[PDB]
Amino acid sequence: MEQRITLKDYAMRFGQTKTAKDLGVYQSAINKAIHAGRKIFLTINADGSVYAEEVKPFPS
Amino acid sequence: MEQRITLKDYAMRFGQTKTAKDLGVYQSAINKAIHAGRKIFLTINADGSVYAEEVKPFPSN
């Protein structure tokens, strides 16, 4: 079973820094996304791996 | 606990008619959305309620 958290809550826990290393991005990207208020969720695998996705309702 | 399926896989088990009904949209929307390879997942609630979301990676390659 995996966990799924908001980009924002997670970054609040781990900080832009790890969050960024974890998503493999440049730090400013986390902040911008968050600042923009986009719906991104990170999934954390049972194994520890992390991934991210943005989500939109269907239909719009 | 929820079940979660792709639109496509859902459309095969049940047919395009149930699919649209379930989501309150119409047939064409489904079939279009599907032909176009949109990444949509349907969540099925415990009370049998259905809902969909389009999902994309982040960041984008």
Curated annotation (Swiss-Prot), chain B:
Effect of residue 58 to D: Loss of dimerization
GO biological processes: latency-replication decision; negative regulation of transcription by competitive promoter binding; negative regulation of viral transcription; release from viral latency; response to UV
Keyword Flavoprotein among UniProt keywords: no
Gene Ontology molecular function: any one: core promoter sequence-specific DNA binding
DNA-binding region, residue intervals: 16-35
Keyword Ribonucleoprotein: no
SUPFAM superfamilies given in the database record: lambda repressor-like DNA-binding domains
Subunit structure, as described in the record: Binds DNA as a homodimer.
Protein name: Regulatory protein cro
Species for this entry: Escherichia phage lambda
Job description of the protein: Plays an essential role in the switch from lysogenic to lytic state and in fine-tuning the lytic phase activation. Mediates the de-repression of the lytic promoters from repression by cI at an early stage of prophage induction. Turns down the expression of the transcriptional activator cII, a factor that initiates the expression of repressor cI, the major component promoting latency. Additionally, cro is able to directly bind to the promoter region of cI thereby preventing the transcription of cI repressor.
Keywords, sorted A to Z: DNA-binding, Early protein, Latency-replication decision, Repressor, Transcription, Transcription regulation, Viral latency, Viral latency initiation and maintenance
